[PDB]
């Protein structure tokens, strides 16, 4: 039951993500986090997480990966989950993110990771939808 | 000092009308109010020959706020309710991204920032949106209190060093040089 | 000192007019009495240049009082009829809750607050309601006895460093600046 | 295992003891250690101002006198005497509501959780005892 | 007998902690320390421990954790105790701490740690009370 | 030995000033392991390590009190000091020291206080 | 140098009354004591045109003190009773939190 060890993540990107004022789709960046705690990662705003840095949130980030979601394309993420790591975070760098409802990041816990089938994460404009299995 | 060499004296900091040689030659009484204001801001902010002053903030406490962060010009002030101290700021510092920002961490929700005003005049925009009053407890103080959203207050306590500190640049709000020096009627 | 510098001098701490160099000019006699009062406040309460002063306080006793507590601007004074010690006070104090509060414990009763007066002007509102006289034992000592409810007299002995101390700010009770200086 | 030491704490709301101009001045509550809760429940609001040390003649064992500044809070941990079978909490507002009789609580000794204290929320000019919830 | 290894700490916070002048409760920060020696952590003042830094006290701090005690709420602390670590420290960042009687920190030794039942630490205003088992 | 049994009989005129009005007294009870610090301290600095327990009883004037408190087995002595208006430090009558062998436990000891004088009553 | 150009000289560092042209024109002898003090602070602290001077502290020993820490304007002097040296301070340095503390 130990073998959660390899993380498999397939992120599909729809045909309209991160649209500007004129509606043109722009290739967003998705930043993949691996943490030791979830309470600090829920207590960060959009500004203090990408722009600039931190020290205690940065003290909790252990692994970090950056993919480019071409609009309509996809990406496949395979990275070794660290043993001291107990939480996975995924955040996007949206052009006009929704900061009131916090739909620009998801907190995938360690016990919710499938060992072989990757989890589908779909984006539609400015939402990081965690698709149900 | 080239055109009004007889009728205007640089006494102290203000300009005064010279009492001699003022027969029938009257100043527009907004014009003396103008360049006695532009020679007060000269003696608070622009003392050394260029824009620079030093004012001190002490953080305050409020009901149900865990952490307030004031950043000006890459100078932090993170207050998580410990024994309060004085952080001696500097405006305008010559850093890479001059701005002003205020973010508060509630008890209920996450960190919603109050305002994020970039540019070299960020800090004057922040003190304009304050709700300031004179401070009796400390001299020469000024207890600012920005009202955030959700009915939460963010209290700070500004102590200057001379005059009004960076509150004196809010004499410049809707300031207009008078078109007429001498009044003719 | 910018408009009446010829007819009005500050000699010592009063503003005396000048007998020579007065035509007659008849000053408003309230106006020579008004600024003679304001220049008396400024030499005791406003001596540094900003609002601030320092008085001491020694607690006094009465018939049927167990504990009398006095809080002003988070300076606490608690008396349970022990040996009386002066405690140096400061008004106004740098705080975020400026005000005063006074509670007494009788032998009959428990804690009853006399008043809780918020605001930076709080201790003056507390010092208004007390009957004063010169305490003859110590100079400059003023007797302070708040007559509470239940007939008790919460006693206090106040010593200042110069002049009347904080009692002088009650001179402004229905103060009026003269609209006219001359006639 | 036992009730032995009293754990109690009071959280006022921001609008307590309001005067005629709407200004919330601070209020004082008082704590009692009682044996029989009849004398305190039957006596009126006026006589507990001065007769509070006398109309509870013998009923009082240990008394605590705790301030409450408006919007503030306070926690008190006083040692409970074993003979005391009741605990009287008496707030003394500037104006009472004697008709509904909401200015006091009487906590039974069995109700006291050993570690987790009981809040007494003050709203307006009324006292209220909150429900119990823990881990 | 080796398994003291995981540290369990449950800190309950009362309904009045870290009160200001107007008596309003404020959510204090509790800084959890892990040492190699108790003598230096006993010999520091309140200013020289949070404000600024050190080098020899900083040479003895190995692990460090920061929790936010919401007034009335609580927190559960679970962190792996280091093997070379032989002392635990807990300090608060009080608004008006008592520096004369030193009631703002506690020194929980290594041999006093329970292996499974977490130790209750209660705060009331401006005291760090180590509750007896 | 196991639990304390004291009774303090306050008079009708206690802690009177030069006017002679009866004023209440708060008293402070201390448990003592060694009487080198409690009995060598003056009246002033005692009210501002060796201090074990600290109980505080108001003496309602004219009334009295029965004092029971849990004892410690390290409490070799019991020193009970009051707060008078006229501290007779040259007579030290504002405190008494009762040894642990001076306890007749099952009947509470009486200490009558008159004016500014604590007096341990003879057993 | 604009109003007292005849009756007041800048001799050395102090100001002196000019002996000529003082027929019946007397200075207030506190005023000469005043601005011979304000031109004596000017020659110690404000020499270069702005506030700056350099003084040297050497720590001392005392009966039963293990370590004294003097911090001025983020400049430390930690003395744990070793062989004493001279730490050349400066004032006022342009650091981030200027202050003074002694522990």
Q: At D81, which CATH number?
A: 2.60.40.4150
DSSP letter at C41 equals: H
- Total beta-carbon pairs less than 8 A apart between chain C and chain E: 9
d(CA G81, CA E75): 44
- Residue B81 near chain E (CB below 8 Å): yes
Number of domains in chain E: 1
Please state, as a whole number, how many other Cβ atoms lie within 10 Å of the Cβ of residue C91. Answer: 26
What are the residues whose beta carbons fall under 8 Å from the beta carbon of C3, sequence distance 6 or more?
Answer: none
- Residue B88 near chain G (CB below 8 Å): yes
- Residue G97 near chain B (CB below 8 Å): yes
Phi/psi region, residue B119 (left: phi>0; alpha: psi -120 to 50; beta: rest), is left
What are the residues whose beta carbons fall under 8 Å from the beta carbon of A22, sequence distance 6 or more?
Answer: none
What are the residues whose beta carbons fall under 8 Å from the beta carbon of G94, sequence distance 6 or more?
Answer: none
Interchain CB distance below 8 Å, E14 and D75: yes
Interchain CB distance below 8 Å, B111 and A45: yes
Query: Omega of the bond prior to C92 within 30 degrees of 0, cis?
Result: yes
Paired with B167 in beta bridges are none
Closest C-alpha to D10, from D70, D51, D54: D70
Helix, coil or strand: residue D125:
coil
* Side-chain-facing half-sphere of A123: CA atoms under 13 Å: 35
- Residue G103 near chain E (CB below 8 Å): yes
Q: Find the closest chain E residue to C96 by CA distance.
A: E21
Chain A positions with Cβ closer than 8 Å to B: 42-45, 47-48, 99, 102
Strand order in the sheet with E6-17: E74-80, E6-17, E119-125, E128-130
Helix, coil or strand: residue F60:
coil
Q: Is chain A adjacent to chain G, meaning 3+ CB pairs within 8 angstroms?
A: no
Does residue C66 contact residue C106 with C-beta atoms inside 8 Å?
yes
**Nearest-10 Cα torsion for G80, G82, G84, G86:** -60
Q: Which residues of B touch C94 (CB under 8 A)?
A: 137-138
- Residue G98 near chain B (CB below 8 Å): yes
Mapping DSSP onto H, E and C, the string for chain A reads CCCCCEEEEEEEEEEEECCCCCCCCCCEEEEEEEECCCHHHHCCCCHHHHCCCCCCHHHHCCEEEEEEECCCCEEEEEEECCCCCCEEEEEECCCCCCCCCCCCEEEEEHHHCCCCCCEEEEEEECCEEECCC
Which domain range does residue E9 map to? 1-133
The pair of three-digit structure tokens given for residue B146, joined into one six-digit string:
């920005």
Nearest to F58 among C62, C66, C83 (CB): C66
Does residue D114 contact residue D1 with C-beta atoms inside 8 Å?
yes
Strand order in the sheet with G100-102: G76-79, G68-72, G100-102
Alpha carbon of C166: minimum distance to chain B alpha carbons (Å): 15
d(CA C122, CA A97): 50
Which resolution, in Å, applies to this structure? 4.0
Closest C-alpha to B181, from B17, B14, B11: B17
In angstroms and rounded to an integer, the radius of gyration of the C-alpha atoms of chain D is: 15
Sequence-ordered strand ranges (E) for F1-123: 6-14, 25-32, 54-59, 65-67, 77-82, 95-99, 109-115, 117-120
Helix, coil or strand: residue E80:
strand
d(CA E93, CA E123): 12
Q: What are phi and psi of F99, to 5 degrees?
A: -70, 160
Q: Which residues of F touch C80 (CB under 8 A)?
A: 24, 26, 58, 83
Closest C-alpha to F4, from F79, F64, F61: F79
Sequence-ordered strand ranges (E) for E70-104: 74-80, 87-92
The pair of three-digit structure tokens given for residue B137, joined into one six-digit string:
């407890």
The pair of three-digit structure tokens given for residue B16, joined into one six-digit string:
């005064």
Query: Omega of the bond prior to B140 within 30 degrees of 0, cis?
Result: yes
Q: Which residues of C touch F24 (CB under 8 A)?
A: 65-66, 80-81, 107
Give the method of determination: cryo-EM
Does residue D88 contact residue D14 with C-beta atoms inside 8 Å?
no
CA geometry: angle C17, C19, C23, nearest 5 deg? 100
Please state, as a whole number, how many other Cβ atoms lie within 10 Å of the Cβ of residue A48. Answer: 18
In angstroms and rounded to an integer, the radius of gyration of the C-alpha atoms of chain C is: 20
Share in percent of chain F as helix, strand, coil (round to 5): 5, 40, 55
d(CA F72, CA F77): 10
d(CA C87, CA C71): 12
């Amino acid at each position: 039951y130990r073998q959660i060890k390899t993380l498999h993540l397939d992120i599909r990107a729809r045909e309209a993500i991160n649209t500007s004022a004129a509606g043109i789709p722009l290739s967003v960046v998705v930043r993949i986090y691996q943490l030791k705690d979830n309470r600090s990662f829920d207590s960060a705003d959009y500004q203090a997480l990408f722009t600039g840095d931190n020290e205690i949130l940065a003290g909790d980030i252990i692994a970090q990966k950056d993919v480019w979601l071409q609009p309509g394309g996809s990406v496949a993420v395979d990275m070794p989950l660290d043993d001291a790591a107990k939480f996975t975070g995924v955040a996007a760098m949206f052009l006009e993110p929704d900061q009131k409802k916090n739909t620009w990041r998801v907190v995938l816990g360690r016990d919710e990771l499938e060992p072989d089938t990757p989890r589908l994460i779909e984006v539609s404009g400015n939402t990081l939808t965690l698709l149900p299995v | 000092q080239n055109n009004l060499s007889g009728v205007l004296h640089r006494e102290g900091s203000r300009w005064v009308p010279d009492t001699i040689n003022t027969r029938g030659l009257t100043f527009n009484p907004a014009f003396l109010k103008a360049i006695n204001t532009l020679s007060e801001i000269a003696d608070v902010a622009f003392t050394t020959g260029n824009a620079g002053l030093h004012f001190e903030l002490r953080p305050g406490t409020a009901a149900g706020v865990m952490q307030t962060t004031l950043i000006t010009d890459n100078q932090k002030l993170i207050y998580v309710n410990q024994m309060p101290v004085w952080k001696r700021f500097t405006w305008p510092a010559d850093t890479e991204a001059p701005g002003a920002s205020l973010s508060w961490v509630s008890t209920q929700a996450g960190t919603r920032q109050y305002a994020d005003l970039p540019g070299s005049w960020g800090l004057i925009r922040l003190l304009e949106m304050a709700r300031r009053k004179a401070a009796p407890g400390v001299a020469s103080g000024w207890s600012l209190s920005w009202q955030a959203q959700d009915g939460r207050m963010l209290n700070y306590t500004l102590r200057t060093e001379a005059g009004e500190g960076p509150l004196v640049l809010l004499k410049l709000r809707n300031f207009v040089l008078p078109e007429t020096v001498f009044e003719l009627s």
